[PDB]
Amino acid sequence: LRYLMDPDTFTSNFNNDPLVLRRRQTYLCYEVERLDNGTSVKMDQHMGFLCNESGRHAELRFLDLVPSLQLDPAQIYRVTWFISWSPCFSWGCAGEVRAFLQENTHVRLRIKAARIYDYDPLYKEALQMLRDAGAQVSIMTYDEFEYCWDTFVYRQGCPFQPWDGLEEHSQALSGRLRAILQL
């Protein structure tokens, strides 16, 4: 029912090797949980993935589709993004997400990023702006990559195969992100 990602597209876009060139696209896998007094309700209708299209970054395209999710404003939600690049500032993503979180205080956001989008001169301000708007931002580790493979990919029951250096790159990126976000 929910359309599943090609496995080579996954591997190519979520690779966290710092030397691989893959700026041209961003893949954003999302899920929404409704929190019903300590109880999480996570429905497949609120799960999917998006990439950039017509020059519009995937994060903005996620914001475009929030009305279609039909979230009840009387309820509390946690959205999680597994995203191949952390959000930018200069093409509007961090500021639109901040505005979204400020307008929708019934929604909380967790962003798990495979790599840091440092092509933007203001990338650190982007990450800090997301943190300060209440988003929990972190770097994807083995556990997250495996979850995404298992959840969003057309894997035909086949297990996640971690690429060489996955852990080393993830811990390195995590150090860099935690230094940016230190409070």
Annotated catalytic residue 59: yes
Q: Under the criterion CB under 6 A, does residue 176 sit at the interface with ligand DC?
A: yes
CB nearer ligand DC, residue 18 or residue 134: 18
Binder of residue 57, out of Zn ion, ligand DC, Cl ion, none (CB less than 5 to 8 A by kind): Zn ion
Q: Which residues bind Zn ion (CB under 5 A)?
A: 57, 88, 91, 93
Q: Under the criterion CB under 6 A, does residue 118 sit at the interface with ligand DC?
A: yes
Binder of residue 91, out of Zn ion, Cl ion, ligand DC, none (CB less than 5 to 8 A by kind): Zn ion
Q: Is 158 annotated as a binding residue?
A: no
Cβ of 110: how many Cβ atoms within 10 Å? 15
Q: Taking CB under 5 A as the criterion, which residues in 122-181 touch Cl ion? A: 138-139, 174, 177
Concatenated DSSP letters of 134-180: T-EEEE--HHHHHHHHHHHB--TTPPP-PPTTHHHHHHHHHHHHHHH
Binding to ligand DC by CB under 6 A, coded x per residue (else -) over 123-142, reads -x------------------
Q: Is 93 annotated as a binding residue?
A: yes
Please say whether the dihedral angle defined by the alpha carbons of residues 44, 46, 47 and 48, taken in this order, is positive or negative.
positive
Ramachandran region of residue 158, left (φ > 0), alpha (ψ -120 to 50) or beta? beta
CA-atom Rg of the chain in angstroms: 16
Phi and psi (nearest 5°) for 87? -65, 145
- Least distance CB 17 / Cl ion (angstroms): 17
Catalytic residue among 31, 33, 53, 59: 59
CB 45 within 8 A of CB 14: no
Report the relative pairing of strands 107-113 and 48-51 from DSSP bridges: unpaired
> Of 48, 59, 109, which Cα lies nearest the Cα of 83?
59
Q: E-assigned strands of 11-98? A: 27-36, 39-42, 48-51, 76-83
Binder of residue 176, out of Zn ion, Cl ion, ligand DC, none (CB less than 5 to 8 A by kind): ligand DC
CB nearer ligand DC, residue 118 or residue 146: 118
Active site residues: 59
Binding-site annotation: residue ranges for Zn(2+): 57, 88, 93
Binding residue positions: 57, 88, 93
Binding site for ligand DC (CB under 6 A): 118, 124, 176
